[PDB]
């Protein structure tokens, strides 16, 4: 039952992902590299991940499990220096949050858990 | 200026992605494999992609470009037969819609276009 | 019990109708034939049909029935070339989606089904 | 310029259509013929037409035109006695409100009016 | 049990009151007597009464009672000719809808009805 | 220019009216005299007046006028002891807030003020 | 059981706090000391406290307790004369409403009350 | 011009405060110490601070200033062990975020800055 570690790691990973999505958003918001259509897309994903991270917290208490929170790490930079480097970063970061959601799911498959099969 | 092909292909790709996200959602909605927490997640992504696909349509008319719509292809199946195979499919499909968004962006970088730099 | 065919055909017909309503909307959105009050009306009907099409999908799983999705056919054109030809098209297309809803209802009348009597 | 008559007639026709859609809705709401999924569909169309009727009123004052209101006629019955007779009635009534919208539009085509071309 | 007459009369009275509130609203909306802050107040009361009129319809079916709809009479004029004459009219009309709500309530007091005591 | 007194008196009168509407609402909310349909109606009017009272405050600063706030007087009782005595009270109190709105309007008529003509 | 006094005092304290937050908001709204970003922050806290004050009223009727309302005292001034003096006032006033919420909670701790432990 | 340090410190302080408000919320959400009315209050403050923290980020780019993000520190515990100790913590933490907002404001007073005077 090492899955509890994967819950709090999935919790802190989406929490981190919205934090990276937030600084990406307000980077394109600076007067200097104004790209309104990108600052809006990244702000929304920031809110989308922050909501999905809380949905998993609620589903944890529904399962009688414990929630341990770690730091939300600093985003790897404050300037992404481009809309195309940040898209590379979000593309790999979106894959990291969805592969880890799949990683934690194959753990609950090998041990049939009717409540951990969701998330 | 082959980018117009990549616009309508990006338009039809997100339109398709929400269509796959919809059948994934209502698959877990069938009384037989009831996984409410998955049918809700896939329904939301279906609405999220359908909205983002229309956002790109609006940004196209803001650019004086033409919008050509193709069929929204049938989802590759009506039963995903698992919550873990569908997660594999969405993980690769989410990567296909975000890599193609990056593909179309490096095309507009090589030809500076101040309006196509967004999307 | 040929009605299941009429369900998936009613599902794919409203799905198609919103797709036609979408291209109609963004046609009047092009800078060239800007008719803001028409692009707004057709965008709303597109969202109205897409919602009503999902309502019927939900009502199908409530009935233990199967949902089979076909392609959403390409709209018959990308340019309607007028606000009055498109109104003819939507008037006949709105009649086609409401007559087929009535067609499927007289099928459930001849075979009393207390759940198929709704839709 | 007989079109002003067609405006107030289109205004009072959608106003009437929502009134018929309302009594249809609360008919299926009576404990006796409870068909929740029909009372909800007709309530929404009642709100949809009442909104669209006010949208045309606003567009009239934008055109400097006069708004004359007539009675909202009594719905042709208080009991539709069936979900299939009411669907016939709404199908023909939906056609009457969309054909008259097309009727008024071919009037503004023969006399180019850049503001009456919308509605 | 003459109260059913007072229900449908209270139903048609609020329905009428929103109809008067609507024409009052769009009167101050005409370019000629533009008083934006009045057209907004009367539009809202029009929506407020139309909602409260439907709330009473729902409460009627909860009571197993019948709903009979009459015409929504034409508003007594299309031009109120002033913001101060219309305020007189709404002040007396608001009193007419709230006194009749009290009239119908003293009828249900004299005959204890635990469901008609609300409205 | 005694109208400023009538502004702050109209401000404090609607502020008071929502305060009376609030205690009326939560009176019918007590387990003892549970009349859910009345506690909901009075809660809404409480929110409706509190909003309309702030709308007049905003319109005052748009006019460069001063806003002086007095106490919101205690509601005349905590128990209305009936749904029919409170309806009498609200009927007269609704008339007091709408007559005073008319009182302040005939003051601005006698002295043409293009901004005080609204409210 | 002196806690009922602390309920109505907590009720009237948040009611007062929103009243102070309202005049603070519309003070910075006057053309003279226009600080839009402050008038918005204080308007929101005014709505936030007014909502939280009603939440406690509802929780009181859930507990079968009585609600006695006092006057909402006049805010200590109509002009705060600065954005920094008002911040001092709100900082101490926010502490007064949260310490009193804690004051009332240690009263319910000393007397175990499973419903008063919330608020 | 040491104020930029106080901006990013105010940004990271509200970001932290919502993070503490979140774990406080879902602590009372655990089946073990279920206090629904507290988990709801702390969840809302978590969303309220997360929004207010982004409002200050937007106001920073409006000022041409730089945004540097630090870690969101781990909340000082995962269990507050009581609803009364957490209220002490939030009372002092709410004072820390509002005193620092006042601290940064007296810095902009001593150096008249017409845009930093808001926040």
- Using CA atoms, how far apart are residues E67 and E11, in angstroms rounded to an integer? 9
The dihedral through the CA atoms of D74, D75, D80, D85 has a sign that is positive
- Using CA atoms, how far apart are residues A26 and A66, in angstroms rounded to an integer? 33
Contacts of A56 (CB under 8 A, 6+ apart): A7, A10, A11, A14, A119
Instruction: Assess contact for H106 and G84: CB atoms under 8 A.
Output: yes
* Resolution of the coordinates, Å: 3.0
Any contact of C with D, at least 3 CB pairs below 8 A?
A: yes
Interface touch A105/B95, C-beta < 8 Å: no
Q: What is the 3-state secondary structure (H, E, C) of B7-50?
A: HHHHHHHHHHHHHHHHHHHHHCCCCCCCCHHHHHHHHHHHHHHH
- Using CA atoms, how far apart are residues B107 and B2, in angstroms rounded to an integer? 9
Structure tokens at B8: 């309508």
Instruction: Assess contact for E104 and E7: CB atoms under 8 A.
Output: yes
Pseudo-torsion of CA G26, G31, G37, G43, nearest 10°? 10
Interface touch A73/H71, C-beta < 8 Å: yes
Q: How was this structure determined?
A: X-ray
- Residue H30: list chain A partners with CB under 8 A: 61, 64, 66-67
Interface touch E84/F37, C-beta < 8 Å: no
Short-list C81, C22, C77, CA closest to C53: C22
- Using CA atoms, how far apart are residues C99 and E35, in angstroms rounded to an integer? 45
Structure tokens at E14: 């609020």
- Using CA atoms, how far apart are residues H85 and H81, in angstroms rounded to an integer? 7
Short-list B111, B103, B109, B9, CA closest to B56: B9
Q: Is C36 exposed, middle or buried (0-12, 13-18, 19+ CB in 10 A)?
A: exposed
What is the CB neighbour count within 10 angstroms for residue A20?
25
Q: CA dist G108 to A47, G101, H37, H88, Å?
A: 38, 11, 15, 15
- Using CA atoms, how far apart are residues H6 and A98, in angstroms rounded to an integer? 36
Contacts of D58 (CB under 8 A, 6+ apart): E26, E29
Q: What is the DSSP letter of G72?
A: B
CA B69 to chain centre: 14
Looking at residue H45, which CATH number applies to its domain? 1.20.1260.10
Instruction: Assess contact for B7 and B65: CB atoms under 8 A.
Output: yes
Nearest chain H residue to G115, by CA? H35
Residue D72: phi and psi, rounded to 5, are -90, 105
What is the CB neighbour count within 10 angstroms for residue B31?
10
Nearest chain F residue to E41, by CA? F119
Q: Which structural domain range is residue C116 located in?
A: 1-119
Closest approach of chain H CAs to the CA of A118, in angstroms?
18
Instruction: Assess contact for F19 and F76: CB atoms under 8 A.
Output: no
- Using CA atoms, how far apart are residues H48 and H42, in angstroms rounded to an integer? 10
Closest approach of chain B CAs to the CA of C58, in angstroms?
7
| DSSP-assigned states of every residue in E70-111 | --BPPPS-S---SHHHHHHHHHHHHHHHHHHHHHHHHHHHTT
CA C100 to chain centre: 10
Pseudo-torsion of CA D83, D87, D89, D93, nearest 10°? 140
Instruction: Assess contact for D71 and E72: CB atoms under 8 A.
Output: yes
Closest approach of chain F CAs to the CA of E31, in angstroms?
15
- Residue A67: list chain H partners with CB under 8 A: 23, 26, 30, 78
Contacts of G108 (CB under 8 A, 6+ apart): G3, G116, G117
A74: left (phi over 0), alpha (psi -120 to 50) or beta: beta
Nearest Cβ partner of H35 from G38, G91, G118? G118
- Using CA atoms, how far apart are residues A15 and A93, in angstroms rounded to an integer? 12
Short-list F66, F27, F64, CA closest to F43: F27
Instruction: Assess contact for H46 and H86: CB atoms under 8 A.
Output: no
Q: What is the DSSP letter of C80?
A: -
Instruction: Assess contact for E7 and E60: CB atoms under 8 A.
Output: yes
Instruction: Assess contact for B12 and B69: CB atoms under 8 A.
Output: yes
The runs of H, that is alpha helices, within G28-113 are 36-61, 83-109
- Three-class SS of residue D72? strand
Q: Provide residues of A within 8 Å CB-CB of chain H.
A: 19, 22-23, 26, 29-31, 43, 50, 54, 57-58, 60-61, 64, 66-75, 78
Closest approach of chain F CAs to the CA of E73, in angstroms?
24
Structure tokens at E25: 């609203």
Pseudo-torsion of CA G2, G5, G11, G16, nearest 10°? -130
Cα radius of gyration (chain B): 16
Structure tokens at A110: 């090998």
Short-list G94, G83, G26, G30, CA closest to H116: G83
Total domains in the fold of chain D: 1
């Amino acid at each position: 039952q090492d899955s509890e570690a994967a819950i709090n790691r999935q919790i802190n990973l989406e929490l981190y992902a919205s934090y990276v999505y937030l600084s990406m958003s307000y980077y394109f918001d600076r007067d200097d590299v104004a790209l309104k259509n990108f600052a809006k897309y990244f702000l929304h994903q920031s809110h989308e991940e922050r909501e999905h991270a809380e949905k998993l917290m609620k589903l944890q208490n529904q399962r009688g499990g414990r929630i341990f929170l770690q730091d939300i790490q600093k985003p790897d930079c404050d300037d992404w220096e481009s809309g195309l480097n940040a898209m590379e970063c979000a593309l790999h970061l979106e894959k990291n949050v969805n592969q880890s959601l799949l990683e934690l799911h194959k753990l609950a498959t090998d041990k049939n858990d009717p409540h951990l099969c969701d998330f």
